[PDB]
Amino acid sequence: GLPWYRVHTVLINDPGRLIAAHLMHTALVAGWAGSMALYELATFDPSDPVLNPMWRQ
Amino acid sequence: QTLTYDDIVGTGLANKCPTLDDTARGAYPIDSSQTYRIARLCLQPTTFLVKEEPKNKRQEAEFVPTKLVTRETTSLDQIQGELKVNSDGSLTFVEEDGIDFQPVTVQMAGGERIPLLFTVKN
Ligand code: CLA
Ligand code: CLA
Numbered sequence A: 001g002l003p004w005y006r007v008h009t010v011l012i013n014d015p016g017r018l019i020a021a022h023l024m025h026t027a028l029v030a031g032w033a034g035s036m037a038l039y040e041l042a043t044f045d046p047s048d049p050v051l052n053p054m055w056r057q
Numbered sequence B: 001q002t003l004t005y006d007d008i009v010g011t012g013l014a015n016k017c018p019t020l021d022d023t024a025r026g027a028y029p030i031d032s033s034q035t036y037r038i039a040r041l042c043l044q045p046t047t048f049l050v051k052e053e054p055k056n057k058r059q060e061a062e063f064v065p066t067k068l069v070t071r072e073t074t075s076l077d078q079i080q081g082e083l084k085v086n087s088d089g090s091l092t093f094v095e096e097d098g099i100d101f102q103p104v105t106v107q108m109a110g111g112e113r114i115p116l117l118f119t120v121k122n
């Protein structure tokens, strides 16, 4: 049996499922970006860019 | 032209005050030995500005524009009162009655709703 640290090696000779794994990785990364922005928007105070700029928050 | 309810209903015009031709730049003389009245006073807001809270440090708060959310429900109209002639010659309007208040809600950036009683009571 494949050891746990080698499971993804089943893509090496399988370009379509390789593409499908890359697509899934890209999905998760773009989803993170959307979710992170939404969290930031939900928590950001826009009311004082002088003394409470984004980098303090 | 004299319009009718059925002409206006649902158009947003019922919330508009009457207007006067571009050529009405005359003058109404005031017979000081005469008593006067306002048969109809109509006010129609077009913009609502709200003073932003100048934070602790402050410097100088501005009046920021706002968005109206309560629709064509904002105008004062059918307001009446006598127009006195003062002894120094000035004129003075004293509201007796009218539709002289409208609750209005505008929204500030960020989404704060500011309700107000737009009014000229008394
Ligand atoms: C980019 C992410 C990614 C992708 C595209 C793949 C893709 C693949 N994996 Mg791998 N895998 C991943 C991450 C990934 N895996 C991770 C993180 C682990 C460790 C858990 C594994 C462990 C693993 C094993 C053990 C096996 C695969 C297998 C496979 C293949 C078939 C799919 C499968 O059985 O999935 C199974 C994998 C999952 C269902 C992973 C789900 C992880 C969940 C979503 C984490 C969520 C945690 C939690 C809910 C977070 C929410 C917040 C929390 C605070 C509540 C395919 C090549 C199989 C294969 O063919 O190998 C020969 C297989 O047997 N993968
Ligand atoms: C683009 C980056 C990339 C890609 C595509 C691969 C792809 C691969 N690596 Mg390599 N690798 C990379 C970066 C990458 N690696 C880096 C940066 C390191 C140093 C840490 C390694 C070190 C490494 C070792 C030492 C080994 C591999 C192996 C493998 C193969 C099997 C891995 C597997 O099944 O995971 C299985 C993994 C799990 C089931 C769970 C992983 C849980 C980890 C510990 C924590 C989870 C992190 C989290 C999910 C999200 C990632 C965060 C951030 C990095 C984005 C596969 C071809 C194996 C191999 O050669 O097989 C022949 C192997 O032995 N990789």
Ligand code: CLA
Pocket (backbone or CB within 6 Å): A015, A018, A019, A022, A023, A026
């Ligand atoms: C027509 C020629 C062409 C074009 C335009 C591309 C373009 C691309 N290839 Mg490559 N590729 C080509 C020929 C081409 N390839 C050939 C002949 C092979 C050999 C079979 C490969 C094998 C290959 C592999 C194995 C992989 C790529 C990947 C990628 C993508 C990585 C970037 C990405 O996902 O961004 C992020 C994506 C977006 C912002 C959105 C993409 C939306 C686009 C506009 C596609 C829309 C639909 C369209 C019809 C799908 C067909 C895509 C096209 C590649 C055929 C990129 C879109 C990687 C990939 O798929 O990553 C997921 C990947 O794993 N390619």
Ligand code: CLA
Pocket (backbone or CB within 6 Å): A008, A025, A028, A029, A032
């Ligand atoms: C340039 C940026 C970049 C790069 C190179 C990669 C590369 C990789 N990521 Mg992706 N990732 C990125 C940005 C990136 N990512 C971003 C911005 C996000 C959104 C936050 C993700 C989300 C993401 C998820 C959700 C998953 C990956 C996975 C993977 C791996 C898939 C191949 C594999 O099997 O590796 C095999 C794994 C390794 C070689 C492990 C490398 C170890 C890295 C350095 C992390 C080190 C340990 C980690 C810090 C411990 C976490 C502890 C914490 C939970 C407390 C590969 C290493 C998948 C993965 O790791 O599958 C198991 C996976 O599940 N990444």
Ligand code: CLA
Pocket (backbone or CB within 6 Å): A026, A027, A029, A030, A032, A033, A034, A036, A037
């Ligand atoms: C479809 C197009 C598209 C557009 C217009 C954007 C636009 C944006 N994204 Mg999103 N994004 C997209 C697709 C897209 N994205 C996809 C497909 C994913 C999934 C991978 C993401 C994942 C993602 C993340 C994880 C994040 C963003 C973020 C952002 C923002 C900052 C962008 C930035 O700094 O990039 C910066 C990109 C770079 C600096 C890339 C540098 C390229 C290196 C140098 C490659 C060098 C190698 C090259 C091939 C060699 C070239 C050879 C040369 C000779 C020509 C911006 C709103 C950020 C944000 O604010 O999110 C809310 C953020 O954190 N995006």
Ligand SMILES: CCCCCCCCCCCCCCCC(=O)OC[C@H](COP(=O)(O)OC[C@@H](O)CO)OC(=O)CCCCCCCCCCCCCCC
Pocket (backbone or CB within 6 Å): A002, A003, A004, A005
């Ligand atoms: C969404 C995020 C998902 C994250 C998923 C979670 C990550 C996945 C699990 C990672 C944990 C790995 C467990 C592997 C552990 C285990 O499987 O090890 C034994 C394992 C044996 O490998 P073999 O080649 O024998 O393969 C046998 C196979 O059956 C294994 O699949 O060796 C490897 O794993 C190589 C690296 C071992 C790691 C060495 C660390 C051992 C530490 C022991 C000392 C402890 C500290 C005590 C001293 C103070």
